Enzyme design. Sequence first.
Site, PDB file in Angstrom:
ATOM      1  N   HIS B  41       0.805  -1.222   0.000  1.00  0.00           N
ATOM      2  CA  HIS B  41       0.000   0.000   0.000  1.00  0.00           C
ATOM      3  C   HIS B  41       0.842   1.278   0.000  1.00  0.00           C
ATOM      4  O   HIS B  41       0.262   2.358  -0.040  1.00  0.00           O
ATOM      5  CB  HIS B  41      -1.068   0.029   1.106  1.00  0.00           C
ATOM      6  CG  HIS B  41      -0.537   0.225   2.494  1.00  0.00           C
ATOM      7  ND1 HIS B  41      -0.369  -0.846   3.356  1.00  0.00           N
ATOM      8  CD2 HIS B  41      -0.223   1.367   3.149  1.00  0.00           C
ATOM      9  CE1 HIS B  41       0.094  -0.328   4.485  1.00  0.00           C
ATOM     10  NE2 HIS B  41       0.181   0.999   4.416  1.00  0.00           N
ATOM     11  N   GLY B 143       2.906   5.943  10.345  1.00  0.00           N
ATOM     12  CA  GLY B 143       4.295   5.823   9.923  1.00  0.00           C
ATOM     13  C   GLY B 143       4.977   4.530  10.326  1.00  0.00           C
ATOM     14  O   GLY B 143       6.086   4.247   9.863  1.00  0.00           O
ATOM     15  N   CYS B 145       4.047   1.519   9.495  1.00  0.00           N
ATOM     16  CA  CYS B 145       3.829   0.479   8.485  1.00  0.00           C
ATOM     17  C   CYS B 145       5.164  -0.036   7.967  1.00  0.00           C
ATOM     18  O   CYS B 145       6.060   0.750   7.738  1.00  0.00           O
ATOM     19  CB  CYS B 145       2.937   0.982   7.350  1.00  0.00           C
ATOM     20  SG  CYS B 145       1.334   1.636   7.895  1.00  0.00           S
TER      21      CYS B 145
HETATM   22  O1  LIG Z   1      -3.575   2.157   9.228  1.00  0.00           O
HETATM   23  C1  LIG Z   1      -2.631   2.737   8.713  1.00  0.00           C
HETATM   24  C2  LIG Z   1      -2.408   2.718   7.210  1.00  0.00           C
HETATM   25  C3  LIG Z   1      -3.501   1.998   6.438  1.00  0.00           C
HETATM   26  C4  LIG Z   1      -4.816   2.441   6.442  1.00  0.00           C
HETATM   27  C5  LIG Z   1      -5.804   1.729   5.791  1.00  0.00           C
HETATM   28  C6  LIG Z   1      -5.482   0.569   5.110  1.00  0.00           C
HETATM   29 CL1  LIG Z   1      -6.746  -0.354   4.376  1.00  0.00          CL
HETATM   30  C7  LIG Z   1      -4.165   0.141   5.064  1.00  0.00           C
HETATM   31 CL2  LIG Z   1      -3.713  -1.255   4.141  1.00  0.00          CL
HETATM   32  C8  LIG Z   1      -3.183   0.846   5.729  1.00  0.00           C
HETATM   33  C9  LIG Z   1      -2.057   4.129   6.736  1.00  0.00           C
HETATM   34  C10 LIG Z   1      -0.802   4.627   7.447  1.00  0.00           C
HETATM   35  C11 LIG Z   1      -0.935   4.572   8.970  1.00  0.00           C
HETATM   36  N1  LIG Z   1      -1.705   3.409   9.458  1.00  0.00           N
HETATM   37  C12 LIG Z   1      -1.571   3.135  10.857  1.00  0.00           C
HETATM   38  C13 LIG Z   1      -0.923   1.967  11.242  1.00  0.00           C
HETATM   39  N2  LIG Z   1      -0.720   1.575  12.506  1.00  0.00           N
HETATM   40  C14 LIG Z   1      -1.156   2.375  13.467  1.00  0.00           C
HETATM   41  C15 LIG Z   1      -1.836   3.597  13.239  1.00  0.00           C
HETATM   42  C16 LIG Z   1      -2.302   4.431  14.286  1.00  0.00           C
HETATM   43  C17 LIG Z   1      -2.978   5.583  14.008  1.00  0.00           C
HETATM   44  C18 LIG Z   1      -3.221   5.962  12.698  1.00  0.00           C
HETATM   45  C19 LIG Z   1      -2.780   5.194  11.658  1.00  0.00           C
HETATM   46  C20 LIG Z   1      -2.066   3.988  11.890  1.00  0.00           C
END
Ligand SMILES: O=C1[C@@H](c2ccc(Cl)c(Cl)c2)CCCN1c1cncc2ccccc12
EC number: 3.4.19.12
Lengths: 305, 301
Positions: B41, B143, B145
């Site tokens: 992604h 961030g 990820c």
């Molecule tokens: O969830 C995501 C990502 C995302 C969003 C939707 C989908 Cl479908 C996917 Cl594959 C990925 C975007 C970047 C950041 N992230 C996060 C990952 N972990 C902790 C987070 C805590 C607070 C805010 C975001 C967080």
Amino acid sequence: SGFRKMAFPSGKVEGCMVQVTCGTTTLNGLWLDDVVYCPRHVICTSEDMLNPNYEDLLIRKSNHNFLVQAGNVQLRVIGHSMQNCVLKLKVDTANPKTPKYKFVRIQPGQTFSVLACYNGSPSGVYQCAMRPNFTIKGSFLNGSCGSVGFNIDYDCVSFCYMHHMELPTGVHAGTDLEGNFYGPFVDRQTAQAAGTDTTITVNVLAWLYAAVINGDRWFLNRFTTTLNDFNLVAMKYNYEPLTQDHVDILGPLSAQTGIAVLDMCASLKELLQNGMNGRTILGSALLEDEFTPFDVVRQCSGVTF
Amino acid sequence: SGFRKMAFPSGKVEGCMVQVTCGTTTLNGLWLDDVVYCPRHVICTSEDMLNPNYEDLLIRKSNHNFLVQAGNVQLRVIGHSMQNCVLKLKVDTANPKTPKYKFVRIQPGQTFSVLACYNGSPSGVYQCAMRPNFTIKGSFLNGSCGSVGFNIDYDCVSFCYMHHMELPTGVHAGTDLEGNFYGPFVDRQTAQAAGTDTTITVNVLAWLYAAVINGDRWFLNRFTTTLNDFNLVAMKYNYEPLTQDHVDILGPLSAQTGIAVLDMCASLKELLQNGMNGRTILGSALLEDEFTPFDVVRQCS
Ligand SMILES: O=C1[C@@H](c2ccc(Cl)c(Cl)c2)CCCN1c1cncc2ccccc12
């Protein structure tokens, strides 16, 4: 989201762990530049542990009596000196993996990461706090002596602890990197017992602020208290006194969550007098006291090293 | 003595963390040999989040669209391929700090260490288990990820997880290092909810054996139970069924402590019935389920 007991990345410290063998004793050493630091009890064996004149024992040891092994390479000791309860073994090779570092003495309540080693080989890393009774509730087996406690600030490793022994209750005692023990402990075979521990109040409040940041608010109430009234209650429940310094340190968290420190104090006051009532805070049924205000800010804002 | 939640030393994994920037998205990558692995992604936009066609998006990408940064050095991407939900960026430099490693897919109940990174820079290391509902109760911000889950086997790093997303309940979903998600999750913004979680029963028993090794015995009782009778009680408290595999796995601990598995099972049933009565087991007022039988033997023995 999420709150975990998180240790500093241990890579910079792993590059410093060496094995120190002297006689029958084998423990861990910390190789920084051309010096290997390790507990001075490594020169001790049977009687040498009970009646330990460490100046006298060290004077009888030759440089070749200390077998230092950095991984599979054997280091040659070109000198030995003692600073309090730590032995310093001067070596002929400076550690190319020596990071930017400082030796710091921490205070009770302060947290640090421990890199547990066996035979100069890192086996695990955990985050713990220096208890108010000056012990660390660690996880150490035979051979872990010499394992170090550290913090990391920017690119600087602050070494704050070196493990020396296990007390009869299973808790641990050690020194700063200058060999000065934390607490009223000695590195000799004698009857030593950890004092009655207290809860690190400032860290419990920091952890309650972390729960609010994470969406856990059930414990919040409409009340506030005076610092004097809270401290009266804290004394009663074996909680460390909360100072004006602690209140100031909790300032950024108080601003981020909109809950004044003395307001959070009234929530803590109620939690102590009434319990959790089968509820949890951050997946725990007890009040966690091993996250400092700085740890909470670091984890809930993502500072990197 | 002592029992702590202990993570593996993260040094071998820190030497592999890089920053991967693609357009506006910046996340972490895992640089092993001449390949950088990261969540696919990183190629997604705002319009391509609910229903992205990743094969179509990646075909429109060129190597120079991927900015890989290992510390202060910028790496040159010489190829890109996709394996399930992971993007593989071939680079012109092999990572000199690449450890001996394996890619392992783990099962629910299994534990691993997570090295949380932001901008390819390690910020912390913690321990956690793959929940039975296939989520991880992590500590992740925007961030994180591409942050990886691992276990260290002597000198070998077994990579088992790569962080992909946060579910609406604050729990986290990710994949193995081959891009295969753990659980019924997809890397789309579509409505996804973690299933009801359960307690990892075998892990609680391992932790009760660790308590006995550490001198905690208050919870022990004179009772034993049949495996099926234990499961009928355990399921009523949202506890995972205990299988014959689990009983066999707890064998060494049963031998070390002299308490039969079904005997410890009866102690667990009692604990579930009575609660703790203001007492703690290994400094905890809840039954810990993120220490596997293997973790207990490693830490105690
Ligand atoms: O969830 C995501 C990502 C995302 C969003 C939707 C989908 Cl479908 C996917 Cl594959 C990925 C975007 C970047 C950041 N992230 C996060 C990952 N972990 C902790 C987070 C805590 C607070 C805010 C975001 C967080």
